[PDB]
UniProtKB/Swiss-Prot annotation, chain A:
Name of the molecule in the record: N-terminal acetyltransferase A complex subunit NAT1
Chain residue ranges for the region called Disordered: 610-652
Lineage, top ranks: Eukaryota, Fungi, Dikarya, Ascomycota, Saccharomycotina
A GO molecular-function annotation: acetyltransferase activator activity
Modified positions (Phosphoserine) in chain numbering: 658
Localization (cell): Cytoplasm
Further remarks about this protein from its record: Present with 7600 molecules/cell in log phase SD medium.
InterPro entries: NatA_aux_su, TPR-like_helical_dom_sf, TPR_rpt
Modifications made to the protein after synthesis: The N-terminus is blocked.
GO cellular component, one term: NatA complex
Organism the protein comes from: Saccharomyces cerevisiae (strain ATCC 204508 / S288c) (Baker's yeast)
Function in brief: Non-catalytic component of the NatA N-terminal acetyltransferase, which catalyzes acetylation of proteins beginning with Met-Ser, Met-Gly and Met-Ala. N-acetylation plays a role in normal eukaryotic translation and processing, protect against proteolytic degradation and protein turnover. NAT1 anchors ARD1 and NAT5 to the ribosome and may present the N termini of nascent polypeptides for acetylation.
Assembly with partners or alone: Component of the N-terminal acetyltransferase A (NatA) complex, which is composed of ARD1, NAT1 and NAT5. Can self-associate. NAT1 associates with the nascent polypeptide chain and the ribosome.
Pfam assignment, any one: NatA_aux_su
Curated annotation (Swiss-Prot), chain B:
Catalytic activity as recorded in UniProt: N-terminal glycyl-[protein] + acetyl-CoA = N-terminal N(alpha)-acetylglycyl-[protein] + CoA + H(+); N-terminal L-alanyl-[protein] + acetyl-CoA = N-terminal N(alpha)-acetyl-L-alanyl-[protein] + CoA + H(+); N-terminal L-seryl-[protein] + acetyl-CoA = N-terminal N(alpha)-acetyl-L-seryl-[protein] + CoA + H(+); N-terminal L-valyl-[protein] + acetyl-CoA = N-terminal N(alpha)-acetyl-L-valyl-[protein] + CoA + H(+)
GO terms, molecular function: identical protein binding; protein N-terminal-serine acetyltransferase activity; protein-N-terminal-alanine acetyltransferase activity; protein-N-terminal-glutamate acetyltransferase activity
One cellular component (GO) term of this entry: NatA complex
Subunit structure: Component of the N-terminal acetyltransferase A (NatA) complex, which is composed of ARD1, NAT1 and NAT5. Can self-associate.
More about this protein: Present with 3310 molecules/cell in log phase SD medium.
This protein's name: N-terminal acetyltransferase A complex catalytic subunit ARD1
Described function: Catalytic component of the NatA N-terminal acetyltransferase, which catalyzes acetylation of proteins beginning with Met-Ser, Met-Gly and Met-Ala. N-acetylation plays a role in normal eukaryotic translation and processing, protect against proteolytic degradation and protein turnover.
Amino acid sequence: LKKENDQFLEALKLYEGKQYKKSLKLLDAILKKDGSHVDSLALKGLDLYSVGEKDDAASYVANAIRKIEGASASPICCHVLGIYMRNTKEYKESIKWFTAALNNGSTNKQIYRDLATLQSQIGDFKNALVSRKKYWEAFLGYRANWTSLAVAQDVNGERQQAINTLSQFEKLAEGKISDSEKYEHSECLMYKNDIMYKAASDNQDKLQNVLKHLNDIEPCVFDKFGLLERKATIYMKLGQLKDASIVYRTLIKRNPDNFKYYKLLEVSLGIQGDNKLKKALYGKLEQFYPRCEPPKFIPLTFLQDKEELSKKLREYVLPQLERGVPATFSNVKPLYQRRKSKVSPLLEKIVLDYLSGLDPTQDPIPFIWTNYYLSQHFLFLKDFPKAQEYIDAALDHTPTLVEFYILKARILKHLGLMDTAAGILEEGRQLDLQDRFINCKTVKYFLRANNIDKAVEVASLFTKNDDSVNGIKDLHLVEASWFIVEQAEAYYRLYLDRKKKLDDLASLKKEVESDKSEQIANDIKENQWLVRKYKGLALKRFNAIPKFYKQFEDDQLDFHSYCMRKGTPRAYLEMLEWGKALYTKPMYVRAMKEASKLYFQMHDDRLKRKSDSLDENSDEIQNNGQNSSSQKKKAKKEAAAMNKRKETEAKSVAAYPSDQDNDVFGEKLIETSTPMEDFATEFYNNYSMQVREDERDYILDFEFNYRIGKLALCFASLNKFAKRFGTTSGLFGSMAIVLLHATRNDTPFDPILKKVVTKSLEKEYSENFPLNEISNNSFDWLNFYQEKFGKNDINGLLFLYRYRDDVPIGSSNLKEMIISSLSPLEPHSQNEILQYYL
Amino acid sequence: PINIRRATINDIICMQNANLHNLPENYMMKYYMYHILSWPEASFVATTTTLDCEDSDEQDENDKLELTLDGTNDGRTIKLDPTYLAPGEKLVGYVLVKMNDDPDQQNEPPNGHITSLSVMRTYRRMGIAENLMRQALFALREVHQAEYVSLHVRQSNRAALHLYRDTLAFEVLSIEKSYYQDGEDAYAMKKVLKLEELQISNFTHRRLKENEEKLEDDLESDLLEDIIKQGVNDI
């Protein structure tokens, strides 16, 4: 060990700059003479990972790791390994390697800052505080160190220490602040105010001191919105009402279009009990802002007189109908969610009286806007023929509006006509090809109309077309979600339709002379193969949204240092909250539920087709053999044609690169080994570790914990659901019946778990569900359910129909009851349930 | 309705969805994260608001109302909709504004740069983008002390032209040939910003006849007079 270290030191400068081939050549020349060099292998792994290679880089890194016994080597190798782990989404190993390097003897304090970022990604703040303290004591000439120390002491719990540190820093640097460093300083001041907020509590002297400090720093703080908000909060936490009212009036003068400021002023003034005071206040404020909308929308929520309410509604709808806004119904969208038989008749009467005095030629714009508003109002009131008549009259009057076509497509979708709606919306979109919202709506409605190829062809227009025949790669690079969700649902519907198709084809079973279904089977086989391939592609596309969220969370590497260098601690806390709440999105929950349903269906049908029927030799023959008719050449030609078609299909639906993911066909995802383990270690642990209290889907947790052998979690979730959302829901009774049928000794599980669940049920719910009817086969649970919770619930009936194999409570009677109970709903939902859910 | 507020990070993903329904030139998550964590006192958002309106009561009471499943029973969750932000709140538009930070070897003073302004086409023609731009310019002038503002506009989009050149009254600076991905020419506009002209209180009225009475907000006024229950001016 003499010349190899010199060559490594002379080649390290190539990696330090912007050189890769010259360093790789030197590493190869070194390894050609001695292959047992750990530093050279560790550098070559990172060099191959930084240029594009993945397999060779991982192999070299694994070899370098295996060629290490103790923790006593050069710190450069450990630093390179830490960089590699940081670049390969490995935080624990990177932290361990950096700690081992710093424990050996490194004179580079900046490495400590790296740890201050790494642990900042895993939440380990106990050692992060010490790392920040060391990195601050190492260099005393940058405000980023002070900001990082303040943030670390505020997040942990050292509030007084952070206040003292900020005070000492401001005393030492009083007057030595440049111009560009003023704003940041102001931001820091605001952050200190936030710290003082944590020292506010309910003490009078503390709040007075915070108010005095805020009034003293007001001439120095540049941010005025947050300053005035904190001032109003302090005034509300004390007792001064006039000063708080003045602050809120100043905020309104700064920005009148804000419902939050108006609500806070209403709460501060204490006039929420009397209606005349609020009426006079809003009538006086209307003269100050005649062009706003909250001052005219909020007073429509506490009116009791019918004549006054009608007059206010008329004065609110007259300017909107005169100027013509594409959101008039939106302006009354939330009110319709809270009022109905009391407000909607008066609004309809006013609109009819206004329309009876208009003219289709003198005032065409108010005429068409009144027609659109009437169509919206009737569509909201479950009316369809009159809405279609109004939209047809509007199209005949002025066929140059996209909103009319959008409303027609929405009505046709609500009436179960998806294809006609897609056709009308495409025809309307072809009128002007410059808007993207209408294109996205058309693609979504085509995906909802069992039309995927045309939807993709329409979407492949505004996308960047380079190394692909369509724009699927561009749609995946712009970070999409709704498109994938809407396309996977169409794939699932098309796959479920094939089940009914095969059932109808097998119901004949070659009845008498039925050679038509026997002589024609190649097309059916090709259609089934295509449907299976698209179903696999759907499962492949499902593995994207969680991966996208993981990539978004991992891309916060340089942000931990940027938020401290630029001086944005409040933005850092906001980013932390955003990263913690990432797993609380509705689209994420929907995608996770769909993935769970798919995995459970795959587990079920795999365990069903594993050991069933008989004669495997007569079933594993398939085709590719016509006896004495050249079977080898025929099978070879068939395989060649299938491969040639699959290559073109994969190039058409190309989304992921070939060097990044080889599972393009998706055959390995639909035939995995442990689906439940993968779903728990990839899709469930994150949602379990990052979740609130009231926002928690108990149905998905119950479905996940049912088929694993753990019933205590099921009982806890059921108890929490009954305590939160009450006990008068059909879902509670359905889950209780499912649990009672699962605790039967006939089902192969754990007798101890069944016994403890039975004891818990007998101890908790003793006068709700008969727990002594598990031995009688004549007791019908459907009658008891419809007597207690009733048959009007749809979610409970859907859950009982989904879990009917393990709970024998009938089938035909349940289906008839569901059909009879679905009638007071919308036709499209009824059709979808009868076609797929039933 | 329309509610203007500051662009929070907890919704930027949904904001990106709005981009998918607006300008074709999309951006990655890093772009939006940088522009939302670098200067948060510039970019604003416009969403909806749903509050109470006579709960239960007695005058034509009905417990079978909608209210996004929040009245009686029907659980209490959020509707499956990527455009929603809260049970009764959805985003209708936003405006992203950045500051000059790249080196130019010329000592450029801190100026305003309007990055993007995207509002849903179905929710326009009622004062949204104009208010967002006014609030952004006022916040920049009050906090960052922006000397001027510079932005870009297209050509076929007559709405943006009427909003910037006509409504906001901006001055055209130069013409950039082939700037976007489609190879369409753009107009780079620039206007010197001031402090005594971008006040919101000076733009409370849309149009006027000739000589009206522009009333603003002075000191106290709402806590004066007497109780509106038995006075002279009590209805």
